[PDB]
């Protein structure tokens, strides 16, 4: 895949931030708390909204602000160049506008009902949410989380390698069995006193 241009407006620090990405290695240099990390999160949210990202409160976009929060992203996958536009009007207005056009020729044509549900789906086709956020986005301190202990890894691996799901599936069916045994025990002690 390849990111060409992020555009954030009124999300945390960024009021009207604009970046032109390029081939090779793009180093983004900035003192701490200078928005960089934010920018990454705008991209990320821009691409997968409304799915969850890191631990970013949905409201972070929706309500904070007097003007509009805006996220424009342009990228390219498999020769095709797609573009997302996430706008959030606030206040009495309170509104969202979503649209992901593809670039055919020189005009931008939609590529799915200009709704939010739609686009999200269309995204799950072009580049699944579980592959980007956890193969492409090497999140911070993950490396190190492997260069320290062994369960810090089972932790990382469990997230990244996507092994969470399974376990909880087992955690519920398991809770379902316990909830059975108890029931038995009850129906037992009742049949005791009674009969």
């Amino acid at each position: 895949m390849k990111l060409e241009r992020v555009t954030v407006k009124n999300f945390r620090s960024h009021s009207d931030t604009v970046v032109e990405f390029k081939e090779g290695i793009n180093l983004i240099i900035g003192q701490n708390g200078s928005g960089k990390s934010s920018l990454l999160d705008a991209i990320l949210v821009g691409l997968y909204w409304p799915l969850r990202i890191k631990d970013i409160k949905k409201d972070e976009f929706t309500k904070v602000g007097a003007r509009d929060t805006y996220i424009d992203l342009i990228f390219e996958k498999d020769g095709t160049k797609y573009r997302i536009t996430r706008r959030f009007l606030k206040g009495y207005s309170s509104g969202e506008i979503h649209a992901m056009k593809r670039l055919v020729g020189n005009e931008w044509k939609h590529v799915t009902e200009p709704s939010s549900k739609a686009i999200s789906a269309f995204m799950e086709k072009l580049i699944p949410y579980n592959i980007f956020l956890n193969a492409i986005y090497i999140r911070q301190g993950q490396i190190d989380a492997i260069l320290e202990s062994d369960e810090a890894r089972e932790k990382v691996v469990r997230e990244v390698l996507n092994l969470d799901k399974f376990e909880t599936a087992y955690k519920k069916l398991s809770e379902l069995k316990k909830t059975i045994n108890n029931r038995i025990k009850e129906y037992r002690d009742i049949l005791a006193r009674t009969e």
């Binding site: 604009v18 290695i25 986005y137 999140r139 911070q140 062994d150 390698l161 087992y170 049949l191």
Partner: protein, 174 residues
């Protein structure tokens, strides 16, 4: 009591499948992870091979109850991560991480690295500036995000941002 007698049987049968089904989930979960890590290592080893220039032949990733251990095979003898040099360490660490990405995606065309360097180190920083130019530039597009000016000369395009008067500003450089 009639009714109370049967609910006990029904309960009992159900206990049998809710229990034998859990077991399978336990089986699969296992396997999913067993393989996954095997193939991850097969990669991690190689990715690590070019990060050290053959110095280290194979990386070993083996899973255990709530814990996945890494070993670097040196002089045939398996060995602990603490056996490696500060650099070789960030190396293996990275080599491992990418290995996963490569497993989960199969191909690595894009790669967003959200700050890997620990407060402008020199030992690590060096190895990264190395890993950077002899391997990573290889990738189509990598977006490295760090506050270690140093890295500024190995990356193709430096785009400096800075919190100037509340709003953030983007100043290009190359």
């Amino acid at each position: 009591r009639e009714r109370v007698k049967k609910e006990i049987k029904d309960l009992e049968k159900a206990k049998d499948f809710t229990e034998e089904l859990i077991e399978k989930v336990k089986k699969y979960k296992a396997l999913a992870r067993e393989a996954a890590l095997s193939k991850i290592g097969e990669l991690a080893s190689e990715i690590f091979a070019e990060f050290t220039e053959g110095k280290y032949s194979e990386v070993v990733v083996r899973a255990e109850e709530n814990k996945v251990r890494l070993f670097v095979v040196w002089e045939g003898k398996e060995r602990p991560l603490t056996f490696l040099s500060g650099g070789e360490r960030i190396a293996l660490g990275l080599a491992f991480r990418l290995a996963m990405s490569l497993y989960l995606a199969g191909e690595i065309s894009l790669l967003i690295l959200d700050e890997p360097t620990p407060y402008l180190d020199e030992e690590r920083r060096r190895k990264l500036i190395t890993i950077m130019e002899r391997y990573l530039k290889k990738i189509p597009q990598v977006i490295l995000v760090s506050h270690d000016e140093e890295l500024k000369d190995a990356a193709d395009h430096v785009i400096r941002i800075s919190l100037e008067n509340g709003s953030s500003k983007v100043e290009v450089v190359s």
